[PDB]
Amino acid sequence: GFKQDIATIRGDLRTYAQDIFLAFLNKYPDERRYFKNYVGKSDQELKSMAKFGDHTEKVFNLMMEVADRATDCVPLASDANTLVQMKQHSSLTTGNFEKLFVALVEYMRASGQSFDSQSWDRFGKNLVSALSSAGMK
Amino acid sequence: GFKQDIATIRGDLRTYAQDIFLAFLNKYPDERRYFKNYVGKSDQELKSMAKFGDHTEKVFNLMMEVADRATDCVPLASDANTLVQMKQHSSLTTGNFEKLFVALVEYMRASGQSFDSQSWDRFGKNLVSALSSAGMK
Numbered sequence: 460g461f462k463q464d465i466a467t468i469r470g471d472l473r474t475y476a477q478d479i480f481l482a483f484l485n486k487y488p489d490e491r492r493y494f495k496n497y498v499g500k501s502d503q504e505l506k507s508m509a510k511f512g513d514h515t516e517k518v519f520n521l522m523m524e525v526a527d528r529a530t531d532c533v534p535l536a537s538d539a540n541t542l543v544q545m546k547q548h549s550s551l552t553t554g555n556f557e558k559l560f561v562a563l564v565e566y567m568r569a570s571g572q573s574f575d576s577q578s579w580d581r582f583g584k585n586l587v588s589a590l591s592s593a594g595m596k
Numbered sequence: 597g598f599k600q601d602i603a604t605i606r607g608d609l610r611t612y613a614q615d616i617f618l619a620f621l622n623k624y625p626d627e628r629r630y631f632k633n634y635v636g637k638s639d640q641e642l643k644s645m646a647k648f649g650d651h652t653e654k655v656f657n658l659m660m661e662v663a664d665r666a667t668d669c670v671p672l673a674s675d676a677n678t679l680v681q682m683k684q685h686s687s688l689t690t691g692n693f694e695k696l697f698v699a700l701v702e703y704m705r706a707s708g709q710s711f712d713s714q715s716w717d718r719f720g721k722n723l724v725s726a727l728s729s730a731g732m733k
């Protein structure tokens with residue numbers, strides 16, 4: 460279930476983070492614009508960039524923290540706050556996050572691994588509603 | 597489902613409030629001790645007792661609002677705060693709440709209705725989790 464999925468992801472965090480982030484960018488090419496160093500780069504080119512691996516690691520670490528702190532796939536209001544308040548996120552809206560979770564769930568369903576994709580879909584939706592309540596547009 | 601159940605309960609609130617609260621006191625006779633005035637009374641005596649009717653209605657009026665404000669059966673932290681901070685709840689621990697929801701879910705399952713009993717069970721558990729987080733012992 461959801462709790463095991465957090466363990467699965469954490470066990471090989473860099474591999475899942477990179478795989479899912481690339482699925483995100485490739486499903487939604489417009490989102491690449493927020494990451495100027497990623498512009499004009501193939502998947503394998505991004506893997507050769509120190510910042511790519513570092514960044515996506517940090518993103519998925521925080522996502523897993525927020526997931527672990529959630530109750531019944533509903534994130535804490537304070538975690539949504541951390542996400543709204545981050546300077547790196549100042550220009551974002553909830554649609555950016557919504558698209559990320561659509562790509563994440565699609566990835567999980569396509570994978571050979573036994574993820575609880577329904578729970579991740581609920582988690583994404585509940586995060587989107589929480590970001591909005593924490594002041595994101 | 598859960599949202600419809602809120603509507604069902606509100607549609608005949610006094611009746612459901614009294615019957616569920618009685619189910620609670622009768623399933624857990626020790627809990628009656630918190631309501632001095634209710635000791636040594638049959639169900640029918642209680643249903644003709646002013647404060648019993650007014651009190652149980654207020655409990656279920658607020659419970660339905662807390663349920664309505666929840667996301668995926670997880671209550672707002674502020675609603676949990678309010679319940680922990682009420683002077684009438686100063687002597688309570690999470691266990692009192694745990695027992696109330698066990699009784700409420702059992703009532704729903706035994707009813708002729710179409711309650712989403714497993715949603716109410718989650719709501720009870722999530723409420724208890726929020727009460728703890730808000731400082732109730």
Ligand code: HEM
Binds near residue numbers: 493514518547555
């Ligand atoms: C639940 C989802 C998300 C989490 C947990 C998260 C977390 C993080 C973290 C921890 C960092 C700092 C990384 C570092 O300092 O190296 C970061 C940076 C950043 N995030 Fe997010 N993020 C999320 C969603 C998004 C989305 C949807 C976008 C845009 C589509 C986005 C855009 C950015 C950008 C542009 C940076 C700075 C990248 C850079 O300048 O190198 N984030 N994020």
Ligand code: HEM
Binds near residue numbers: 627679692
């Ligand atoms: C989510 C569940 C609960 C809600 C929404 C709730 C709500 C309320 C409300 C609104 C009142 C004030 C009513 C009035 O002024 O007439 C009240 C009073 C009170 N509550 Fe609760 N309550 C809950 C659970 C409990 C539990 C589990 C107990 C103990 C086992 C409890 C013990 C009391 C007592 C002793 C009073 C004062 C009774 C009186 O007016 O004489 N409550 N509650």
Ligand SMILES: [N+]
Binds near residue numbers: 467572
């Ligand atoms: N695995």
Ligand SMILES: [N+]
Binds near residue numbers: 574577578
């Ligand atoms: N699932």
Ligand SMILES: [N+]
Binds near residue numbers: 713714717718
């Ligand atoms: N249940």
